[PDB]
Amino acid sequence: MEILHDEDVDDSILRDKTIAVMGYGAQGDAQANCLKDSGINVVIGETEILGGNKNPSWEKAKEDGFEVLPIDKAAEKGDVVHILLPDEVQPAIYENQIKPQLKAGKALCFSHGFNICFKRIVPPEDVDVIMVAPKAPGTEERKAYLEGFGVPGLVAVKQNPSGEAREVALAMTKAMHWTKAGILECTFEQETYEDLFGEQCVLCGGLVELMRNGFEVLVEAGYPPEMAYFECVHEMKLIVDLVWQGGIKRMAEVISNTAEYGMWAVGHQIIGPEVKEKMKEALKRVENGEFANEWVDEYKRGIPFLKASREKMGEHQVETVGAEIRKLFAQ
Amino acid sequence: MEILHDEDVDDSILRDKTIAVMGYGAQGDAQANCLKDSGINVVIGETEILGGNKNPSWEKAKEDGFEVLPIDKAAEKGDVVHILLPDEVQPAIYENQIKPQLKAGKALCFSHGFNICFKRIVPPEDVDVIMVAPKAPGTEERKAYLEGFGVPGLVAVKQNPSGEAREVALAMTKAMHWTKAGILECTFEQETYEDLFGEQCVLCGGLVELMRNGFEVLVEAGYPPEMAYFECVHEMKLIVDLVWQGGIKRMAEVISNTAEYGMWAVGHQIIGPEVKEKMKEALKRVENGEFANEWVDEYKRGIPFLKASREKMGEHQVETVGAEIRKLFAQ
Ligand SMILES: NC(=O)C1=CN([C@@H]2O[C@H](COP(=O)(O)OP(=O)(O)OC[C@H]3O[C@@H](n4cnc5c(N)ncnc54)[C@H](O)[C@@H]3O)[C@@H](O)[C@H]2O)C=CC1
Ligand SMILES: NC(=O)C1=CN([C@@H]2O[C@H](COP(=O)(O)OP(=O)(O)OC[C@H]3O[C@@H](n4cnc5c(N)ncnc54)[C@H](O)[C@@H]3O)[C@@H](O)[C@H]2O)C=CC1
Ligand SMILES: CC(C)N(O)C(=O)C(=O)O
Ligand SMILES: CC(C)N(O)C(=O)C(=O)O
Ligand SMILES: [Mg+2]
Ligand SMILES: [Mg+2]
Ligand SMILES: [Mg+2]
Ligand SMILES: [Mg+2]
Numbered sequence: 149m150e151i152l153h154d155e156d157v158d159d160s161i162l163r164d165k166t167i168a169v170m171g172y173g174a175q176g177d178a179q180a181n182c183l184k185d186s187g188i189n190v191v192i193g194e195t196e197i198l199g200g201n202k203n204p205s206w207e208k209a210k211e212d213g214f215e216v217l218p219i220d221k222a223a224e225k226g227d228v229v230h231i232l233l234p235d236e237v238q239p240a241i242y243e244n245q246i247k248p249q250l251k252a253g254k255a256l257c258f259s260h261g262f263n264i265c266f267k268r269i270v271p272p273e274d275v276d277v278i279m280v281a282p283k284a285p286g287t288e289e290r291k292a293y294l295e296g297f298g299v300p301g302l303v304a305v306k307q308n309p310s311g312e313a314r315e316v317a318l319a320m321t322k323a324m325h326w327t328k329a330g331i332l333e334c335t336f337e338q339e340t341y342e343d344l345f346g347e348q349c350v351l352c353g354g355l356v357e358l359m360r361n362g363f364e365v366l367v368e369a370g371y372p373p374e375m376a377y378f379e380c381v382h383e384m385k386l387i388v389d390l391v392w393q394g395g396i397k398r399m400a401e402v403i404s405n406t407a408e409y410g411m412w413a414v415g416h417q418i419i420g421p422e423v424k425e426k427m428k429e430a431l432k433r434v435e436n437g438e439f440a441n442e443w444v445d446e447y448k449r450g451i452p453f454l455k456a457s458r459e460k461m462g463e464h465q466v467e468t469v470g471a472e473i474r475k476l477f478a479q
Numbered sequence: 480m481e482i483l484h485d486e487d488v489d490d491s492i493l494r495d496k497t498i499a500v501m502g503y504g505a506q507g508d509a510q511a512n513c514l515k516d517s518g519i520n521v522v523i524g525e526t527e528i529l530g531g532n533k534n535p536s537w538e539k540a541k542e543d544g545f546e547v548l549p550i551d552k553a554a555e556k557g558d559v560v561h562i563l564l565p566d567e568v569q570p571a572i573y574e575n576q577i578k579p580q581l582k583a584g585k586a587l588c589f590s591h592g593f594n595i596c597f598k599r600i601v602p603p604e605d606v607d608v609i610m611v612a613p614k615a616p617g618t619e620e621r622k623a624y625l626e627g628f629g630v631p632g633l634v635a636v637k638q639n640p641s642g643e644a645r646e647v648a649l650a651m652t653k654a655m656h657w658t659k660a661g662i663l664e665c666t667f668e669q670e671t672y673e674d675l676f677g678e679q680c681v682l683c684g685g686l687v688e689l690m691r692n693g694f695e696v697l698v699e700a701g702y703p704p705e706m707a708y709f710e711c712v713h714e715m716k717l718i719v720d721l722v723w724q725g726g727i728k729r730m731a732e733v734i735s736n737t738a739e740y741g742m743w744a745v746g747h748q749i750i751g752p753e754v755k756e757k758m759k760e761a762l763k764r765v766e767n768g769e770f771a772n773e774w775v776d777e778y779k780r781g782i783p784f785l786k787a788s789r790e791k792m793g794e795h796q797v798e799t800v801g802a803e804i805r806k807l808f809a810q
């Protein structure tokens with residue numbers, strides 16, 4: 149399918165418009181600053197006190213030069229109400245702090261399709277509902293913008309009572325320079341499923357488990373953990389950069405013939421058919437709502453699995469030895 | 480285990496030594512230029528004509544301002560004869576072109592232990608035998624050096640009849656700035672096995688099979704290949720950059736809580752204990768000489784598996800669509 153770039157998109161429609169960016173975290177910080185840098189009027193909706201403490205994201209937004217309002221006041225003010233809060237808390241915050249401020253002619257915007265896809269938020273009929281979803285972590289998205297490039301993005305329109313929903317959504321992507329990498333138009337559901345799949349199976353789940361297992365195999369065989377860290381973790385960035393630049397082709401050219409042979413002779417013995425079938429099963433659970441139900445129930449129960457996994461992550465030798473090695477860099 | 484940095488190593492021994500770099504490819508080009516930039520005297524040993532045509536590596540090294548000799552004359556001139564030719568061709572080139580020029584107390588150096596470890600090259604008793612092995616592809620090694628940093632390295636000594644083998648090896652890594660990231664001392668056999676394992680199971684085989692299988696799963700489920708590319712390949716660099724900078728801890732902080740939950744809930748279902756067991760098996764074939772014999776036999780046969788693999792790689796959709804996408808970026 150077709151990829152839209154700067155040459156395809158008009159950003160003019162944003163001249164008269166205020167974007168209320170709700171949540172100043174990984175995506176909200178990046179997107180609000182890219183938007184502001186591009187001359188768009190932005191206000192931040194944030195919560196001053198969370199769990200009984202000062203919310204550092206409220207203080208940061210202020211310090212970074214934004215108008216910062218309570219979410220309800222931001223919503224009143226925004227022509228686009230762009231929800232960059234954690235997915236698990238959006239439905240409550242939406243019901244309670246956003247919805248009463250919606251009015252015909254506002255657009256409700258997201259950067260992930262989850263809450264609309266799975267019907268955890270069902271907006272009123274007379275608001276536009278759009279998605280601008282970056283295929284990037286927010287910190288790296290901001291740096292791409294600052295380097296004169298951008299990250300790829302997916303754009304979706306669920307409701308269009310204004311007639312202008314698509315044009316607004318695309319214009320935002322252009323203002324954020326995501327068009328420099330490329331935009332794909334899709335549905336809320338499509339983005340939801342691919343994105344859950346990729347993070348679980350490839351980018352976060354897959355990557356981390358691959359590196360951790362390799363690291364463990366070396367250490368359990370008697371290799372020093374520092375050596376396992378350099379081989380399995382530090383060098384991953386250097387190899388991935390070659391793929392990002394020129395595909396497998398470029399990476400395969402630069403590595404030794406020994407390594408290239410090993411890649412093809414042995415890689416598929418490690419990550420074989422069984423992995424691909426497990427990926428299929430995970431994708432099914434994404435598509436059919438089972439994974440969504442699990443995550444909603446997890447959050448309802450006070451995220452005990454997530455809390456325990458975070459504590460266990462930090463105890464792993466890959467993390468303790470990595471932190472010691474990186475702290476000793478002359479960088 | 481001790482990691483050596485800049486303050487731990489003295490490179491002054493290289494002051495009156497000439498390094499003959501044999502092969503000006505990914506490693507020879509990077510290493511030669513880092514050494515030359517640090518003020519070390521380097522000569523290139525290369526072959527003017529390969530397969531009946533002008534060898535571009537010969538020309539490039541002339542163009543980059545080196546003295547470029549046939550391998551035999553380069554070996555004569557070098558105090559350090561540093562073999563950065565493809566592993567599979569070193570034994571014949573060593574026997575024919577290098578070995579007769581070896582004199583007592585020269586140092587024979589490698590950047591991978593394979594040929595010494597598996598006894599494909601058996602050096603005379605009266606030369607030092609050293610290894611300076613960067614944990615990095617050569618293009619990214621050169622970039623790190625130009626950026627004021629360095630790549631991690633492994634340093635081994637197999638023979639030390641001069642007494643100065645270790646000092647020379649370490650000095651080389653400091654002059655190439657690898658000490659800025661850090662150097663580990665190890666044996667030739669240790670480097671060989673960890674290196675082979677890492678490229679097979681994690682960095683090249685594992686990484687490429689992980690991304691390819693994810694990409695296929697999406698495309699086979701009806702998602703556009705451009706979408707599968709941005710999700711499974713382009714974003715991988717952005718994620719791995721976080722891990723490289725601050726470990727899994729940093730990455731987990733930046734991704735969404737939805738993604739962090741997915742990572743821990745689902746990742747190990749994709750890449751699980753069965754994968755770890757395959758990794759153990761692959762490591763055993765590396766340690767026991769099976770892999771090494773297969774790669775020798777493959778080369779002796781005219782690399783038909785590697786040729787067939789190259790061809791099929793370049794026909795995969797991940798490669799053809801990725802190339803089309805990357806051509807359309809606007810940096
Ligand atoms: N880079 C990423 O993290 C990516 C995120 N997404 C999507 O972007 C959206 C935002 O995600 P993130 O930036 O990771 O959010 P985040 O986890 O950084 O949260 C944003 C801000 O929400 C506030 N917040 C946190 N918990 C709260 C609560 N209980 N009540 C009120 N406010 C609270 C905090 O000030 C926080 O800084 C999500 O829909 C996510 O799926 C899309 C692409 C990538
Ligand atoms: N980045 C990498 O590619 C890494 C390589 N290594 C090791 O470095 C050493 C060098 O590997 P690479 O740089 O990949 O070598 P390469 O494959 O780039 O070969 C170096 C040069 O050797 C010459 N050459 C090629 N075939 C030849 C033949 N049949 N006869 C004569 N000369 C020939 C060509 O001019 C070529 O540029 C190996 O021991 C390898 O395991 C170590 C770390 C990483
Ligand atoms: C990997 C990560 C940045 N990502 O793309 C996400 O969609 C997420 O954080 O949810
Ligand atoms: C991954 C690759 C660059 N590597 O570290 C090697 O050992 C190789 O190219 O053989
Ligand atoms: Mg994503
Ligand atoms: Mg996501
Ligand atoms: Mg090659
Ligand atoms: Mg290696």
Ligand SMILES: [Mg+2]
Pocket residue numbers: 404406407591674675678
């Ligand atoms: Mg190798």
Ligand SMILES: [Mg+2]
Pocket residue numbers: 731732733734735736739
């Ligand atoms: Mg979080």
